Paper text:
In this study, we investigate AfuABC (Actinobacillus ferric uptake ABC), a BPDT originally identified as an iron-specific transporter in Actinobacillus pleuropneumoniae, a Gram-negative upper respiratory tract pathogen. The locus afuABC encodes 3 polypeptides corresponding to a conventional BPDT–AfuA (a periplasmic binding protein or PBP), AfuB (an inner membrane permease), and AfuC (a cytosolic ATPase). AfuA is a class II/cluster D periplasmic binding protein with two globular α/β domains linked by a dual β-stranded hinge. Instead, AfuABC is a trio of proteins that bind and transport sugar-phosphates such as glucose-6-phosphate (G6P).
A subsequent ligand screen by ITC with structurally similar molecules revealed that three other sugar-phosphates including fructose-6-phosphate (F6P), sedoheptulose-7-phosphate (S7P) and M6P had affinities of 8, 57 and 960 nM respectively for AfuA. Structures of AfuA bound to F6P (2.0Å) and S7P (1.3Å) were also solved to confirm ligand coordination. Similar to the G6P structure, both F6P and S7P were found in the β-anomer conformation. Between the three holo-AfuA structures, strand and amino acid placement and conformation were identical (RMSD < 0.4Å between Cα chains). F6P binding affinities of the single site AfuA mutants displayed the same trend as for G6P, suggesting a similar binding mechanism between the two ligands. Our observation that both furan (F6P and S7P) and pyran (G6P) ligands could bind AfuA suggests the position of hydroxyl determinants is more important than steric fitting of the overall ring structure into the binding pocket. On the opposing end of the pocket, redundant phosphate-coordinating residues such as Ser37 cooperate to hold the phosphate moiety of ligands. This bipartite binding cleft is able to discriminate between isomers of the same sugar-phosphate (G6P vs. G1P) and between differing orientations of side chains around the carbohydrate ring (F6P vs. R5P).
Numbering used by the authors: 0 to 318
């Protein structure tokens, strides 16, 4: 066993486990992970900043990792594999120097349980963000909570960029009566839509694509007004105990093999950032989508992330 590695993972358990096992088997490193939301994981790393408990932060959305970079929580390391990453996303965070790197892309949207829709007596599948404010969807939608979930923050930032911040919060307020719960995890609305516990889930479409691929009666929607996206992040923690192995993990996560195994074995259907990697047949093609130019440098920062989340809690979660 060539050393150890502790991962804070913010992707799904199945993806994290497959990455940790594939790394351990490829490189003989004793690898373990702890899984938590992108926002939850940031708070934990910030809290542990004097005596870091993990070596790398893998998966989840980029914005909290960018914020961690800004706050001095990360250790800069540019993997030679960055040369293979889509040039647009080679060094995308607020603070340059690859404190954080982009390992995948996820499209924000929603999906609809077409069988439950029918039971609600609704015949039209919603096609726009605006449709989700219709009163007939009372208690029939779920979205995550940005206090824990990177997905929820990606949505907030997407809406602020689309409509302007004030209209974004107006949207949250009109959406609110249709939300049955603000979920801790970004993926929970996908799971509950798949279950038919809810009719509409808002989140990253590859999660819905996997439920669909496994039989769920879901129709995925890229909303007609346009939408944003996540970059999945990988970052080394400042003070990492196993630095060398952390660098090796970053290499692997940015590698053709490390990215392909996410969809080949890890049941994770994000679009890959390594231009030499084979994409899943179910991965979204960004060139075909109505996407805003999501400003990672701007929203992966405290003056947006802490401000908007605290504002979201004040005006939406409370009143
Ligand atoms: O919203 P959360 O809980 O931080 O999780 C975000 C992550 O969940 C996923 O959608 C799971 O596939 C990831 O692509 C994304 O990075």
């Amino acid at each position: 066993s060539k050393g150890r590695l502790v991962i804070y993972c913010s992707a799904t358990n199945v993806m994290c486990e497959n990455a940790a096992k594939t790394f351990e088997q490829k490189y003989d490193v004793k690898t373990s992970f702890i899984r938590n939301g992108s926002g939850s994981t940031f708070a934990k790393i910030e809290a542990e900043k004097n005596n870091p408990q993990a070596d790398v932060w893998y998966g989840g959305t980029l914005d909290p990792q960018s914020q961690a970079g800004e706050l001095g929580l990360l250790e800069a390391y540019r993997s030679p594999n960055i040369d293979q990453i889509m040039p647009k996303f080679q060094d995308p965070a607020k603070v340059k120097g690859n404190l954080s790197s982009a390992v995948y892309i996820g499209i924000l949207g929603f999906a609809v349980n077409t069988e439950r829709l029918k039971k609600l007596g609704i015949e039209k599948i919603p096609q726009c963000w605006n449709d989700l404010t219709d009163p007939k969807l009372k208690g029939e939608i779920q979205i995550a909570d940005p206090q824990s979930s990177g997905t929820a923050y990606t949505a907030i930032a997407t809406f602020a960029q689309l409509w302007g911040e004030d209209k974004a919060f107006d949207y949250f307020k009109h959406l609110h009566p249709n939300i049955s719960q603000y979920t801790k995890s970004g993926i929970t609305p996908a799971r509950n839509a798949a279950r038919g516990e809810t009719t509409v889930g808002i989140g990253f479409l590859h999660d819905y694509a996997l439920e669909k691929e496994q039989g769920a009666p879901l129709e995925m929607v890229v909303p007609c007004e346009g939408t944003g996206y996540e970059l999945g992040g990988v970052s080394i923690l400042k003070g990492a105990r196993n630095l060398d192995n952390a660098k090796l993990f970053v290499d692997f996560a940015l590698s053709k093999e490390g990215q392909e195994t996410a969809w080949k074995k890890g049941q994770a259907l994000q679009t890959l950032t390594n231009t030499t990697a084979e994409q899943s047949p179910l991965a979204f093609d960004l060139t075909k989508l109505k996407l805003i130019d999501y400003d990672f440098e701007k929203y992966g920062a405290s003056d947006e992330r802490k401000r908007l989340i605290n504002k979201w809690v004040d005006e939406i979660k409370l009143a």
